[PDB]
Design a protein around this ligand. Structure first.
Ligand SMILES: CC(C)CCC[C@@H](C)[C@H]1CC[C@H]2[C@@H]3CC=C4C[C@@H](OC(=O)CCC(=O)O)CC[C@]4(C)[C@H]3CC[C@]12C
Ligand SMILES: CC(C)CCC[C@@H](C)[C@H]1CC[C@H]2[C@@H]3CC=C4C[C@@H](OC(=O)CCC(=O)O)CC[C@]4(C)[C@H]3CC[C@]12C
Ligand SMILES: CC(C)CCC[C@@H](C)[C@H]1CC[C@H]2[C@@H]3CC=C4C[C@@H](OC(=O)CCC(=O)O)CC[C@]4(C)[C@H]3CC[C@]12C
Ligand SMILES: CC(C)CCC[C@@H](C)[C@H]1CC[C@H]2[C@@H]3CC=C4C[C@@H](OC(=O)CCC(=O)O)CC[C@]4(C)[C@H]3CC[C@]12C
Ligand SMILES: CC(C)CCC[C@@H](C)[C@H]1CC[C@H]2[C@@H]3CC=C4C[C@@H](OC(=O)CCC(=O)O)CC[C@]4(C)[C@H]3CC[C@]12C
Ligand SMILES: CC(C)CCC[C@@H](C)[C@H]1CC[C@H]2[C@@H]3CC=C4C[C@@H](OC(=O)CCC(=O)O)CC[C@]4(C)[C@H]3CC[C@]12C
Ligand SMILES: [K+]
Ligand SMILES: [K+]
Ligand SMILES: [K+]
Ligand SMILES: [K+]
Ligand SMILES: [K+]
Lengths: 242, 242
């Protein structure tokens, strides 16, 4: 029927898109990865030769460094750290900066995610719908001062998304002393609920315990961006769902 | 109105849930984190004292080890690695095992995610609807051999989810030599599109290049679990959306 043809076309398009993306990523990153691996191997070989580090102790040092990486940013299991972890869990971001080490803790986290994901999704959908209604009312008032089409709403939403991304990138560049492009990429990754974890905020000089205002601003910005993303998805994506 | 009261109640419930989760996580993980940090500091101090490692070179060693961690699993930017990265990107998992190192690569990844997320969501929704229809038909045929209620469908979906999770956990425990509970936790994390990245498959002894069958099975299992999760969300969660 129509549904079978539609889903077959969707599957074929998804497979072709995946193949094209994999080919482009390989062709763009193979040489860079090879050069980085060669440089790292040369550096580690030189360091091992200079310090005469035993092979057996090298694995222990690597394990210790890997396990102590989250602890180098301070205490990640305080009230602020626990709140950040809960926010990441409920939003399905998965930064990976801190993970439970207890089986009971893992089970509690699983139950927490199960009981919290639908509630967060419903709240985000409602907030996005309310924001869309408010934006439509504001646009109508502006037009009266100076009917609304779907293209105008789409353009307004895209402009709002771009402005929010630019504001977040500028704020993160000013706070964490990051590059503008890097801050923009990190903001885009955070707002898409992907969570690569390469760039994690509130992980420098113990900012989670000495800068409550920065933490509050980051939480507010994350919530606002998530609401904007949900509103945009409702405006453009949810229409093709049912 | 009703919508304002509903969204205010949702926000209050979400805030209370976040506070409770943060309090429980802190009370459960503070002592464990303190003990782990103390043990790691003692071990690193002992190693530094034994090897007389200079403080300046310690930072260089830490940076080299952190940068070379993905490369220890083999070549992560081959065809299989690029396909895995694209699959993680389109599914918003964000494992974080491999990340782009080029600005052009980052921009391409951002555009890829933007152009692929709605398509993947639509395909998953259609596949979940088709699976729900097939399950309803199978249940009707079974009942005839031996009308259907919503509670029966919910129970069948929950049982299917539990069976899929158990099968995935058993397969991952048999393949990667992981614990049953750890495999179950990793499967749950992967199927919820959260992606902590603590446990990543296809990262041992170069399995991405020597075991094509294992990679294909992992891809099929991930797709099947994502389809099951989408079908369950459509059955129980999507009803409260609109
Ligand atoms: C800025 C961002 C949010 C843009 C997102 C783009 C989407 C609006 C596009 C991208 C992929 C598109 C889909 C790609 C393939 C198809 C299959 C297509 O089916 C057919 O052509 C056969 C069945 C029929 O005749 O309807 C129906 C539209 C649909 C779901 C498309 C709907 C619109 C989608 C989701
Ligand atoms: C309507 C649009 C166009 C503009 C929105 C206003 C912004 C320009 C404001 C609103 C909130 C502000 C932020 C609120 C809180 C903080 C934390 C603040 O941090 C501290 O005070 C402690 C750390 C330090 O000493 O820098 C630094 C500024 C910043 C990011 C502010 C930067 C400027 C922001 C983004
Ligand atoms: C309807 C909307 C606008 C409600 C918004 C609520 C915010 C005003 C609240 C919710 C969560 C709060 C945060 C939750 C946790 C913390 C950690 C907390 O840190 C500590 O308790 C330890 C460090 C210290 O002693 O300050 C400082 C306040 C802060 C950032 C809070 C600041 C105020 C926040 C952002
Ligand atoms: C195993 C998993 C799939 C469980 C998923 C649980 C959901 C089915 C629950 C969890 C939170 C619930 C929501 C929590 C709060 C509210 C607000 C509530 O609104 C009111 O009480 C005021 C308005 C009115 O009177 O209807 C309406 C139901 C709703 C959306 C609930 C609908 C059902 C939800 C999404
Ligand atoms: C209907 C339900 C109840 C059962 C579904 C059947 C499973 C028991 C089968 C179907 C697919 C099978 C998997 C397909 C592919 C592989 C890869 C295979 O790996 C290799 O052959 C190479 C690595 C090695 O040497 O172990 C190991 C078995 C495994 C996980 C299989 C384990 C058994 C599985 C999960
Ligand atoms: C309608 C549904 C059932 C379609 C299912 C398609 C699968 C049969 C395809 C899609 C993606 C394929 C995989 C894409 C990439 C790779 C990596 C590839 O590895 C290499 O090319 C290098 C190593 C080697 O030389 O084998 C081996 C095959 C494999 C696992 C493929 C196996 C077959 C897969 C799972
Ligand atoms: K993630
Ligand atoms: K990570
Ligand atoms: K996600
Ligand atoms: K991650
Ligand atoms: K994620």
């Amino acid at each position: 029927k129509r549904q079978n043809v539609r889903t077959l076309s969707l599957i074929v398009c998804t497979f072709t898109y995946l193949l094209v993306g994999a080919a482009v990523f390989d062709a763009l990153e193979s040489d860079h990865e090879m050069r980085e691996e060669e440089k790292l191997k040369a550096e580690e070989i030189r360091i091992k030769g200079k310090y005469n580090i035993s092979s057996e102790d090298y694995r222990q040092l690597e394990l210790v460094i890997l396990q102590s990486e989250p602890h180098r940013a301070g205490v990640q299991w305080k009230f602020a750290g626990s709140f950040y972890f809960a926010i990441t869990v409920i939003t399905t971001i998965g930064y990976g900066h801190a993970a439970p080490g207890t089986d009971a803790g893992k089970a509690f986290c699983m139950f927490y995610a199960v009981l919290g994901i639908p509630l967060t999704l419903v709240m985000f959908q409602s907030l996005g719908e309310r924001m869309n209604t408010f934006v439509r009312y504001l646009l109508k008032r502006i037009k009266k001062c100076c009917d609304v089409s779907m293209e105008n709403m789409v353009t307004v939403g895209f402009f709002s998304c771009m402005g929010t991304l630019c504001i977040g990138a500028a704020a993160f560049s000013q706070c964490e002393e990051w590059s503008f492009f890097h801050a923009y990429y990190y903001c885009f990754i955070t707002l898409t609920t992907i969570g690569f974890g390469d760039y994690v905020a509130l992980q420098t000089k113990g900012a989670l315990q000495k800068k409550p205002l920065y933490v509050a601003f980051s939480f507010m910005y994350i919530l606002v961006g998530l609401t904007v993303i949900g509103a945009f998805l409702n405006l453009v994506v949810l229409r093709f769902l049912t």
